[PDB]
Amino acid sequence: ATVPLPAEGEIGLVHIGALTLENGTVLPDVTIAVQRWGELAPDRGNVVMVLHALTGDSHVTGPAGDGHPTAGWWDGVAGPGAPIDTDHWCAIATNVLGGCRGSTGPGSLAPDGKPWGSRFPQITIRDQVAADRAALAALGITEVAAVVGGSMGGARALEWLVTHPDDVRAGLVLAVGARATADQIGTQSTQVAAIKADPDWQGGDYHGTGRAPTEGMEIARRFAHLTYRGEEELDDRFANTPQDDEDPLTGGRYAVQSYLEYQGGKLARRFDPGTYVVLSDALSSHDVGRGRGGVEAALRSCPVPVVVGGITSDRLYPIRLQQELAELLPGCQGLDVVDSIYGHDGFLVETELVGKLIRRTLELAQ
Amino acid sequence: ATVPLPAEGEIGLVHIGALTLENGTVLPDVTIAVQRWGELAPDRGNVVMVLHALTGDSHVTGPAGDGHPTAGWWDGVAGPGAPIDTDHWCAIATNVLGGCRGSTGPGSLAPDGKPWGSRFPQITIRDQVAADRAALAALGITEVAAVVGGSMGGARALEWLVTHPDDVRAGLVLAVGARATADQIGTQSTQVAAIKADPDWQGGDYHGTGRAPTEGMEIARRFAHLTYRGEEELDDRFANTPQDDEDPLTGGRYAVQSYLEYQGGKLARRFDPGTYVVLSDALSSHDVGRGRGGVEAALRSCPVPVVVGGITSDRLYPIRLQQELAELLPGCQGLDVVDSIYGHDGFLVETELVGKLIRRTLELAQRLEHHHHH
Ligand SMILES: CC(C)(COP(=O)(O)OP(=O)(O)OC[C@H]1O[C@@H](n2cnc3c(N)ncnc32)[C@H](O)[C@@H]1OP(=O)(O)O)[C@@H](O)C(=O)NCCC(=O)NCCS
Numbered sequence: 001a002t003v004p005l006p007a008e009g010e011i012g013l014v015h016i017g018a019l020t021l022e023n024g025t026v027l028p029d030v031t032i033a034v035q036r037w038g039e040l041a042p043d044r045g046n047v048v049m050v051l052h053a054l055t056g057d058s059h060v061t062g063p064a065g066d067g068h069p070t071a072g073w074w075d076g077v078a079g080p081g082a083p084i085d086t087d088h089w090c091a092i093a094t095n096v097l098g099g100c101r102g103s104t105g106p107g108s109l110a111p112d113g114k115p116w117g118s119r120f121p122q123i124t125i126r127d128q129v130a131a132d133r134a135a136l137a138a139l140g141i142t143e144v145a146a147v148v149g150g151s152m153g154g155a156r157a158l159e160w161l162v163t164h165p166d167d168v169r170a171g172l173v174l175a176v177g178a179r180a181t182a183d184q185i186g187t188q189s190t191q192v193a194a195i196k197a198d199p200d201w202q203g204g205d206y207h208g209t210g211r212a213p214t215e216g217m218e219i220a221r222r223f224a225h226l227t228y229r230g231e232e233e234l235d236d237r238f239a240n241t242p243q244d245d246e247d248p249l250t251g252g253r254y255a256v257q258s259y260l261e262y263q264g265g266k267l268a269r270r271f272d273p274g275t276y277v278v279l280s281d282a283l284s285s286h287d288v289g290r291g292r293g294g295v296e297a298a299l300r301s302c303p304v305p306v307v308v309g310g311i312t313s314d315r316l317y318p319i320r321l322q323q324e325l326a327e328l329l330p331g332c333q334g335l336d337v338v339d340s341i342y343g344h345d346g347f348l349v350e351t352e353l354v355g356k357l358i359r360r361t362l363e364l365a366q
Numbered sequence: 367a368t369v370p371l372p373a374e375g376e377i378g379l380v381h382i383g384a385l386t387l388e389n390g391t392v393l394p395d396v397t398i399a400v401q402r403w404g405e406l407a408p409d410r411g412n413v414v415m416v417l418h419a420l421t422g423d424s425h426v427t428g429p430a431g432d433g434h435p436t437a438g439w440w441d442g443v444a445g446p447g448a449p450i451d452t453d454h455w456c457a458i459a460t461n462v463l464g465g466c467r468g469s470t471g472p473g474s475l476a477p478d479g480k481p482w483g484s485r486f487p488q489i490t491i492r493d494q495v496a497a498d499r500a501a502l503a504a505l506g507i508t509e510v511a512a513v514v515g516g517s518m519g520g521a522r523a524l525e526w527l528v529t530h531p532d533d534v535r536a537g538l539v540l541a542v543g544a545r546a547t548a549d550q551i552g553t554q555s556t557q558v559a560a561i562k563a564d565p566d567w568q569g570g571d572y573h574g575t576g577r578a579p580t581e582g583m584e585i586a587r588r589f590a591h592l593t594y595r596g597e598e599e600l601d602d603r604f605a606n607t608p609q610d611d612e613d614p615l616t617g618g619r620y621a622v623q624s625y626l627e628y629q630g631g632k633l634a635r636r637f638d639p640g641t642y643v644v645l646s647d648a649l650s651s652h653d654v655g656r657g658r659g660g661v662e663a664a665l666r667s668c669p670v671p672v673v674v675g676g677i678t679s680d681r682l683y684p685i686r687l688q689q690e691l692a693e694l695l696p697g698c699q700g701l702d703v704v705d706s707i708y709g710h711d712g713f714l715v716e717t718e719l720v721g722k723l724i725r726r727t728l729e730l731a732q733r734l735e736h737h738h739h740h
């Protein structure tokens with residue numbers, strides 16, 4: 001028999017065996033964590049793959065419960081009558097390859113019984129697509145109706161569409177470019193440098209030592225969070241106001257500073273530094289044109305119907321990038337402009353508008 | 367009492383004594399380092415104050431040498447017939463209060479004989495103006511024809527205009543806003559956090575230990591440098607290209623990564639981390655409206671003729687902030703746009719465009735000084 005799907009909402013661990021990675025390294029004994037919502041159709045033809053971003057996991061939707069400290073990262077997107085209507089669709093999400101919430105990553109044990117750490121291979125977005133395709137195949141699923149994702153999830157979705165157009169009926173590519181830009185690599189590589197600068201990094205082999213480079217990751221996340229915001233919205237929310245009763249003139253904090261310190265600590269309580277490094281390097285690797293004659297050739301090659309969404313105020317994946325995708329993907333009918341003040345984080349915060357784009361995508365999937 | 371100006375181009379150390387700071391802390395025995403180009407007129411009416419930005423110093427113009435690692439940060443701006451025409455003007459630049467290039471800052475010795483370090487007071491942009499005014503007063507200078515500056519130097523210029531309008535004829539305020547924004551405080555406070563996270567910070571008292579938080583300041587500087595760039599120009603320049611023959615798919619560097627590493631190292635060879643912290647916190651403190659009924663009231667009642675410059679691609683001080691300054695300052699005729707792909711760093715790179723804004727500011731100041739009697 002195939003590997004059974006987990007019960008609705010529960011985590012299933014799908015063992016896919018060795019994975020030959022794009023750089024030629026063979027990564028042995030890979031496990032991919034899966035969650036799903038909705039029944040799989042008798043014909044197995046109704047799967048909607050939900051692809052999480054840098055710090056997301058398989059927990060797309062649902063409340064904080066046992067195993068899940070917080071609500072789903074796209075809470076409400078999948079369910080009865082929801083944008084992914086689970087009365088008709090089977091929503092499946094993995095924890096990405098390199099992750100820390102059930103899938104093989106740097107904190108996982110290597111063959112030698114020690115955490116991978118510094119021995120974890122450099123993975124690409126294409127390696128993440130291969131791990132997900134292999135997990136689905138083990139569950140008896142060889143094609144999907146659609147792929148949906150924003151940010152790193154949009155890079156995963158775009159590689160899935162360009163690499164395997166015969167095995168996807170439609171896609172949502174939201175708030176990403178065709179390749180990593182210089183600014184993205186610059187902030188990603190410097191975020192990684194902040195983690196590696198922390199003396200508790202221990203060369204990436206901190207797993208199990210009782211010390212971890214959480215301080216360097218909090219620094220990385222504070223800078224990333226600024227890239228995720230709309231500049232004007234951030235100033236309208238916080239301006240130069242002090243935090244509560246503190247006096248910045250005598251060494252107290254500003255409200256925006258306190259908010260960033262809080263965002264850092266929240267990530268430190270739920271996310272592994274080594275995964276942050278591996279997935280940041282996979283984002284820097286992103287390039288749908290590699291080995292295919294460049295981005296224009298690779299996008300023009302892809303005939304799949306695609307909804308391309310970009311956020312007007314996005315500072316990290318500026319809308320010029322989504323205009324490029326919309327112009328070159330022949331299955332794209334035009335750029336869907338998400339006119340939002342909330343920056344790149346609009347892909348998480350604008351649930352109503354992102355849900356509209358998901359409904360359009362699932363119409364194209366038929 | 368009156369101290370002489372240094373010889374042209376050379377450093378002068380002006381001792382101004384105690385300075386009462388905005389937060390009420392007294393900073394004893396302050397020294398301000400000064401460089402000048404051009405003669406001081408007998409009537410002392412021809413002074414152009416050049417106000418440096420975060421990592422700048424008093425070396426506005428001229429070559430590397432006589433203790434300067436590199437050419438002036440605005441090399442070419444001052445000279446015969448140049449945008450600051452030293453045949454007519456006396457261009458004076460200080461090293462800012464809190465600096466590490468001759469002025470009193472965290473690396474300087476406190477009265478107890480140990481570096482200020484963690485004991486260095488929190489200073490504001492207004493403290494920086496007050497120190498520079500005191501350095502001028504010690505040199506016998508009470509009136510300035512013009513203040514000119516970009517970035518932190520624009521914050522200094524704008525506070526000078528608003529605080530001392532009767533003692534400035536005109537100003538150039540380039541690539542800054544009326545107050546620090548949430549984004550600027552976010553990146554400045556996080557840069558400071560990257561320095562304080564470095565175990566060699568030693569609470570700020572690393573000076574003279576033989577250890578320094580250069581690694582954390584390099585991280586800070588790499589993030590700052592991205593804020594200073596034009597996004598499109600950075601992608602056209604480097605894209606996702608690898609550095610030389612390195613292979614990023616097996617752990618090598620990208621070109622933009624190598625470039626950022628290089629920029630951080632260059633700062634670590636010339637600049638003090640404690641100074642980076644003190645001056646970044648001074649930028650976060652910028653607010654021309656504080657104690658003045660807010661930014662709109664403060665700028666509306668400032669009568670000084672002002673040229674406001676903003677750079678189209680600036681991601682750190684976006685052009686909406688200079689549109690705001692140009693609308694509110696009654697002496698501003700309209701925003702002067704610097705059409706540049708180089709982001710915030712345009713204030714340093716676009717020498718011809720910035721030079722034209724300086725020359726216009728000083729043609730304005732010369733007309734006004736002819737009609738100013740003191
Ligand atoms: C919550 C979210 C959906 C957007 O909201 P937000 O911008 O965080 O705004 P909120 O005001 O709700 O702030 C959330 C928290 O900030 C806290 N907060 C607000 N102002 C604060 C201040 N001045 N100081 C400290 N904490 C503050 C609130 O207490 C709240 O706490 P909680 O989340 O634990 O309940 C956020 O998760 C998001 O969109 N960004 C995350 C990006 C991400 O996860 N990336 C990884 C993959 S990209």
Ligand SMILES: CC(C)(COP(=O)(O)OP(=O)(O)OC[C@H]1O[C@@H](n2cnc3c(N)ncnc32)[C@H](O)[C@@H]1OP(=O)(O)O)[C@@H](O)C(=O)NCCC(=O)NCCS
Pocket residue numbers: 419420421422517594609621622624625626628632711714715
């Ligand atoms: C003045 C300034 C803005 C000029 O910028 P610019 O003329 O556009 O120059 P760039 O930003 O392209 O820098 C070129 C340098 O990068 C180096 N470089 C370029 N590509 C590189 C790469 N892939 N790897 C490594 N180094 C690289 C060059 O070798 C050159 O080095 P050099 O300056 O020692 O000769 C720049 O010197 C600078 O950023 N420093 C001033 C200080 C500052 O921005 N802030 C302080 C107060 S705001």
